Design a binder for this molecule. Sequence first.
Ligand SMILES: *[B]([O])([O])[C]([C][C]([C])[C])[N]C(=O)[C]([C]C1=[C][C]=[C][C]=[C]1)[N]C(=O)C1=[C]N=[C][C]=N1
Ligand SMILES: [Mg+2]
Ligand SMILES: [Mg+2]
Ligand SMILES: [Mg+2]
Lengths: 233, 195, 235, 240, 244, 222, 231, 212
Amino acid sequence: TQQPIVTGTSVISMKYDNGVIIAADNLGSYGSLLRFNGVERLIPVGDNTVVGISGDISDMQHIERLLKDLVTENAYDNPLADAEEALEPSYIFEYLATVMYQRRSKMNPLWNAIIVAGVQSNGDQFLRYVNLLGVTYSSPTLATGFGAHMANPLLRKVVDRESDIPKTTVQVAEEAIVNAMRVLYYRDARSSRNFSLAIIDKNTGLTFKKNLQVENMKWDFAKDIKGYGTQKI
Amino acid sequence: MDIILGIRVQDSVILASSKAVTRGISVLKDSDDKTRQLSPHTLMSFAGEAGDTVQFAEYIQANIQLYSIREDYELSPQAVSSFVRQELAKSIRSRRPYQVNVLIGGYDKKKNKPELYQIDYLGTKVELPYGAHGYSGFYTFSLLDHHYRPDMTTEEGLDLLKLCVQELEKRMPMDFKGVIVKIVDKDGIRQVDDF
Amino acid sequence: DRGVSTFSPEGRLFQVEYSLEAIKLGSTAIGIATKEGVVLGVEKRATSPLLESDSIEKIVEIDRHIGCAMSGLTADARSMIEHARTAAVTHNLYYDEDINVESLTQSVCDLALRFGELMSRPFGVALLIAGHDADDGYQLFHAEPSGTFYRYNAKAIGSGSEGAQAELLNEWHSSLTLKEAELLVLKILKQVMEEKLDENNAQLSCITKQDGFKIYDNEKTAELIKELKEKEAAE
Amino acid sequence: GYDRALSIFSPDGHIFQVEYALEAVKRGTCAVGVKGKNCVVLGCERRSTLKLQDTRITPSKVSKIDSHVVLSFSGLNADSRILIEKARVEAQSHRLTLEDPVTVEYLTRYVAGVQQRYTQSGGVRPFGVSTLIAGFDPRDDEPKLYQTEPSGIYSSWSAQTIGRNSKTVREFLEKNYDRKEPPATVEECVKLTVRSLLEVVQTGAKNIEITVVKPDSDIVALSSEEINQYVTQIEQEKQE
Amino acid sequence: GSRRYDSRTTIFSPEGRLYQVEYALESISHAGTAIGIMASDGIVLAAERKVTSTLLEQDTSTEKLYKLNDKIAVAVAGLTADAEILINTARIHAQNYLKTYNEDIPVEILVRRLSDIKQGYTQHGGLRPFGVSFIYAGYDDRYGYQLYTSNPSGNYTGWKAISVGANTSAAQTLLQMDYKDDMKVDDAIELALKTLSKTTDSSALTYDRLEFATIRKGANDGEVYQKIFKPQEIKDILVKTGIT
Amino acid sequence: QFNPYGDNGGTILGIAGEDFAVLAGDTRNITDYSINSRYEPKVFDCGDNIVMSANGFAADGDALVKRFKNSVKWYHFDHNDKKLSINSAARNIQHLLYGKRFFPYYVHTIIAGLDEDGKGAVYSFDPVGSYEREQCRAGGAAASLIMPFLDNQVNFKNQYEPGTNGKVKKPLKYLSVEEVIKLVRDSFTSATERHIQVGDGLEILIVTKDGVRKEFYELKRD
Amino acid sequence: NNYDGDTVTFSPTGRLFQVEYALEAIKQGSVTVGLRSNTHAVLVALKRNADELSSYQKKIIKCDEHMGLSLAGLAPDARVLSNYLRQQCNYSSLVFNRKLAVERAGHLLCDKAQKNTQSYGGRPYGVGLLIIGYDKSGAHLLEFQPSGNVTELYGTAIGARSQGAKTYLERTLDTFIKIDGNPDELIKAGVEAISQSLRDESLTVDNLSIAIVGKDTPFTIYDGEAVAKYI
Amino acid sequence: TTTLAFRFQGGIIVAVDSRATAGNWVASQTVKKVIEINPFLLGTMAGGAVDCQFWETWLGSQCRLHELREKERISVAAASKILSNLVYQYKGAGLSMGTMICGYTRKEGPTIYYVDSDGTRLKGDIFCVGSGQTFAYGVLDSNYKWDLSVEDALYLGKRSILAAAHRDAYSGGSVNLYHVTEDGWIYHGNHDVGELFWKVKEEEGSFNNVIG
Ligand SMILES: *[B]([O])([O])[C]([C][C]([C])[C])[N]C(=O)[C]([C]C1=[C][C]=[C][C]=[C]1)[N]C(=O)C1=[C]N=[C][C]=N1
Ligand SMILES: [Mg+2]
Ligand SMILES: [Mg+2]
Ligand SMILES: [Mg+2]
């Protein structure tokens, strides 16, 4: 049993017709202090998987090393390491999901919420969640922390059920993700303007976008707001 | 369990022990014998936490019986009491201590003397003319302080014991359903069937 | 000296092969499987007339649906029986059912090769494990100290084994009755035994679906011996 | 730990260490067991090479395992103590858990199991001891007499002997013991036990020990004079 | 592997003997003779030191007679270093028994314990046995004065008079000849020294070649006194008995 | 302080027919007042014509089902591809659950299938492994809403025959698979209305001698 | 000679005799054949009986839904090794939700057998195994030797008189590799291959044991009247 | 829970209720609170459902192993002590059990042992265990005799459970009756309290408080 120290906030994601999108801001908070402004919380594994991690950053860095080590280990005595026997999103997830549940069972959890986004060998979209308790679930849209409360409602308006996935293009999906990130910046007191976004498409592969910023923000209306009720000046 | 008494007279040791076994709300049994014969001339009564009492008593009994067979010889009451004390003194610093208090009444055939030892769950041993565990002593020690004379006969000891049990039956809140009395002397151990 | 788990140049474990020699010195045990039941019979072979022969326990119950006969260093069998009994009962506890005779035999045979430098040597005893289950019906297995077990329609182990096996070769057919099998075990035991066969120096047993495993009384076996004598004198 | 396999099979299918343990038993002083109709008697040889002995304190050959069961032996004396101790512990353990004393068969089965375990355990040699275990089951008047040996096999006997010159006394018992009518009384049973030892012992003085066990934990060891009276009566009848 | 070099100390011969025990007994047969004699009013322990030197500091020397507790003592025959290992174990066992039962350990119980330890080295562990034979001289309130002996096999027996070490055959014959049941300590002292004087491989028996001890109820009233004799006291008793 | 347990909501329902058995369960997965997934399968085909669901804390539920499926696999290896009977599966599950008696699988387990006589069977478990064969059992969040309805409409409790006035009970006539599915659907529709953790979808697994069939129905998504 | 007392001793020519003696136990074992195409992999095993009353010793063991082997030599050693494979296949499924690769299964067997050849006290395994399987890279056939050497092959045979079946497969290489989408013809070629290792005895109904795995075919074993079709 | 067992002329009567609760929620009305350990031994269940179940069917495995090893039926004393010694090892861990081990043997006759998760093991003639034990005791103690017929003894046990089923909120459902002799136990049916109450009320003239 511990307490999280340096923490990362929401990770948001959704499926679309040819793949999956995942995003997370670049902040490492130290309680109310916005301590570290250059933290990458999307960690790619091969060219077909991206693992988005929230929660404790020291435990994230530990998980990052496990995944790095997993790639190394898979390559050993494996002539098809970059082909048929390459790591799948489903393999990477189940490994993490095993570790998370084992650690919670020893009463010493990795204090994280993880979303594994990727595309399988057969072109199928993979998107599944796991957290410090070993709880796992899948959905057309997945989000951690504040994202669960604010992003999911917006993303579910695009893909409300399974049959909406083929009808959703990458442009519409990315637009929804970027809007959700803006909303989180308005409303999450432990978020940052700077974020990373990753697209895993079955045709165009892995596109990893760094140094994105929340833009087109509405603040002008603030000038008209005066006092807390009766004040006019 | 509740009330266990002991009194050492001229030529014997007398142990009285309640018959009631109460588990919270109800009295499950009114004929329970809270004692074990460790050897032909050594008797141990006991009272404490449920389960622990019998488990401990039978464990001690087995060990003394083992000794008796190995050496073809009966340990002195003093020796047995010292063995018991060590087990409890070992027990008190265990993961889960034996929560048992005991009285060891024996007749030493070598010295031709009755002997009564009082040992609590901490391993606190004392040799006494008369003893008790729990709240029994609070009522009975005053009577015994007054009446006990060390040259008493076994019949006088039983009468003094009746006076103790009567006082307990008058002033104690719990109904302990009377006592089973046992006498330990040169001829061994016997039970007084009418008390 | 040399390792306990050493291979010979022929590709056999020395100690396993030597334990098989000890089993050849053991008293004869015979098993016959039929569609009406499996019969198990043994030679008691008391070393002296003062030895109370009914204390010789070379046929043993593992469960209600599984029996066992032994041959060789019979003292070694006790831990094998204990394991078998525990395996049978434990499986009933985990699965609320009887354990398959093959599965029981496999569990016993797993102990066999757990020796090295675990126990210091292989078992010096062979077992005939007979039983019944719903899936494969009446079965007879021969469990060796090599860890190998063969299923048999009929089998003889011990000192008079190859002579008895040749006799079982001719006599066994798939339509044998239980009564016919009982007499057949008695017939072959009488053939290979040194001393004259009677109810005190030979013991019978069987396993049926209805009644389960039963060791025969000396009075019951005595009648089957008398029935045998008359039918051999009949031609 | 020392794990060396000492007891192992030989090409002819023998475990020599177990068989050499039997040779140690052959060397040991003779011990005999005879059961009557309502009693069992255990006779034991004391070699008279050792005089100036203190017979009060010298370990007696017959040992009580419980108040109703006894154990005598032939072979290595030091080894026998280990078996007796284990047996006594198991006897008390059985009373503690089953709330009933051991049967003579159960106690024998335990001791035999210990002996067997030492024939296929690493780093240990077999016990150089064969035992005669005798007594009466709780609330039972049927006499019991069992024998064990280093290999771990055990069995029940109407009468049996072990140790040096046991071949001779077994010869005697085989012709003199009738199963249809065993020694009806204590006297007859003790007499037959002393007679059987007199075939081997040498002098009937302090060389014969006799222990009589009767039902309901009634065990007593005969004294020198009591045994000497049997020795006297046997030879006076023999002079004819 | 290592098997190649294993002597196998705990095995039977074809005849059913324990090789190492037999060879340990052969070792002990060359050790200085030790004699124990039990009387009605006490026990005597006499023992011969092995070919000493004039430059050996005798008054601070101890190779034969050791104290286990106030009631029990032992005479050693064999490897002294081996004996001290067992002696320290025995001393602890006596103290464990005292702490547990608050009574001095009965002699036989102590003897059985040491003998069981010796036995263990003959049956398991693959180690050599202790090349030691003890004579236990002790007293308790059950059996009174007791003499025992134990050897590397772990077998022990009780005695009225007994010898261990060298020339036990000759020594035991002499004891068997002159020993009587109604004997007293002063007489037993004389018998012990006379026996050593005849069985010794030395030219003459002197004070500097002896260790001597008595366990007497010759202590003021109902109690027991151990007396480990000093060099001068051994010299006096040698003159008294008429050996020097 | 770290709390190793959580509540993923949901509700399950097992009903044993005369020659069939059904095991139903909603597809909603939640924490607190949030929906994790509107379709997260909860009832699983474990092979050997046995269906299983471990409702409550989903991580412990998934772990248990995973370990039982594993137990079925090793039962085939160790016992010559023998079919694991529903009663034997039930006893095996008791030991799985009790193995963690002092750190329990925080779930309400139900299995369904056919007994060795071919009749419908449902077994129910508590978190620590106590079990019992039943004709009817609801488990999970809305179990308190559903069970009374099933006592009334499956076992005809408190129902009597008109005209007799309490003297003659309503006879316990058997229910068809079509009749059971109606009661299952009405149970979950009703449970969805009054329980916030129940909704989104209903997935029913039907077990007969022919095998395991699936049926899915929409539930209210509020 | 002097260097065959244990597995920890090289001979002067650099040989490990205990390993070679373990290899000898395989040659005494009954013949078994393995072969594959691009779609399916087949095991064929000649089972051996003790006598006419006895059963025929089982030769084929299932490790997973997509993998299994046939044995030749000490059967208990095959049980130990097949159990290990079952566990490794199972660990791969539970932890990684991934069917174990047949090549990786061979690597694991090699390393397990190796530890027994370098350490004192233990002994080499006394059995040879033919592992077939269908994974993400198609059909596979492995040959395991208890020296540790594992080899991926198109076809092979181990046991007594296995050289006859091995030569046949070496001739038929170009034919049977092309038998795609036809299990019965691939088994026929396997039954015809194992027939080249027979003397005196012939393939009967309780003598023959066949197993197959493929694209849409779980590892299944055929015994009894199920193989009468191929006799 | 209400369970009772009492010795009498015709052997032993064992009677139990059927209810299982989780708080105020009635979890089951059809619970088997009597374990058939073998054809001669019965065990009653009270307290934690699983603890009682698991360890009493385990007890049956230990009893079976005993009679395989000793070629003799296990005594009620030995069987009860196996269970009490087992739970004593777990003492403090939080096991929750109140059990009667009931049986007949030649050497003992009809015997009942109260075994307890605190380690208590008591031999006796009458025992009532569970939340509704006090209610059952009232009926039993006022109507008990050694000289009862198997028929009358069975009814007294049935009636004593009914008494507790009525008053104790955590008891009810139905009554399971057993009768233990020297040829084994004999089941005497499941008796629904919903029908038994009105039957007993009418025939016996009791429960005049309640309106029917
Ligand atoms: B009885 O009321 O003690 C009963 C006996 C048990 C064998 C079924 N126990 C229970 O009902 C307990 C709760 C309880 C109530 C009153 C006293 C003691 C205990 N219930 C459970 O153990 C349980 C098990 N599974 C589901 C629900 N409840
Ligand atoms: Mg005190
Ligand atoms: Mg809502
Ligand atoms: Mg009520």
